Each structure stands twice: as C-alpha cells, then as structure tokens.
C-alpha cells in the first residue's frame, strides 16, 4: 500500500541514472523508471533528460492526447506542494 511522496524539484534534480528517471513534465513528479522497461520507441531518450525538465522536447515530439493522460499514471509522489503552489506558467503548446 502507499502514500504520496511529495518531493521538491531540487531533490529530483539529484537522481538521474540507475533505475531512477523521475521527471517534471507539466509540474508533476513522473516516474519513468517503470517505463524505462515499457515505453515505445526507447528508454535511453527517457533517461537522457531524467531529473531535469523533459517537457518542451517531449511536447515537440507531440506527446499530447493518450500519452499526455498516461503521463498522469506515472504519478508516484507529485511535486512538493511548495514548489507546485508557485509553479510559474511554463509555456506552450503542442
Ligand atoms: C511520462 C510521459 C510519457 C508517456 C506517457 C509517453 C508515451 C508515449 C507513447 C504512447 C508513444 C507513442 C505515440 C504514438 O504512437 O502516437 C511515445 C513515443 C515516443 N516517446 Fe514517449 N512518453 C513519455 C515521455 C517521453 C519522454 C520524456 C521522451 C523524451 C523526451 C519521450 C520520447 C519518445 C519518443 C522518441 C517516441 C517515439 C516516437 C516514434 O514513435 O517515432 N517520451 N511515447
């Protein structure tokens, strides 16, 4: 069973490698480590950015629709409500 594990942007900008690719697509801590062994196309691309900001590039490829909704299924803990309360309106678009 489980609990929300609200982690800050900073914390998530630590980890990267080693079966732990968490991302801030659209202001939420998304675990891609599961998808590292599932996601269509490849996992290397997932891991490249990892704990950074793999949003713009992801949307550039056209991750809207289905994948965008599925993004929400990788919710393991979300952002810290602190950061998240001040989440500046990012950008754009696709
Ligand atoms: C957690 C969010 C993610 C979800 C739910 C997701 C889901 C998907 C899905 C369903 C496809 C196929 C789309 C289609 O067939 O129309 C796809 C393809 C792809 N994804 Fe993701 N993805 C995610 C994150 C990422 C990230 C972070 C990257 C790297 C920036 C990435 C790079 C790619 C690439 C390169 C493809 C292959 C494009 C092709 O089929 O030629 N994805 N993704």
UniProtKB/Swiss-Prot annotation:
Question: Which membrane topology term applies here?
Answer: Single-pass membrane protein
Task: Specify where it is mainly localized.
Answer: endoplasmic reticulum
Question: What's one GO-annotated cellular component?
Answer: membrane
GO process annotations (BP): response to cadmium ion
Instruction: Give start and end of each Cytochrome b5 heme-binding domain.
Output: 4-80
Source organism superkingdom: Eukaryota
**Which controlled-vocabulary keywords does the entry list?**
Acetylation, Electron transport, Endoplasmic reticulum, Heme, Iron, Membrane, Metal-binding, Microsome, Transmembrane, Transmembrane helix, Transport
What positions are modified (N6-acetyllysine)?
A: 2, 5, 14
Function recorded in the entry: Cytochrome b5 is a membrane-bound hemoprotein functioning as an electron carrier for several membrane-bound oxygenases.
- Per the similarity annotation, which family is this? Belongs to the cytochrome b5 family.
Q: What is this protein called?
A: Cytochrome b5
Instruction: Print the organism lineage.
Output: Eukaryota, Metazoa, Chordata, Craniata, Vertebrata
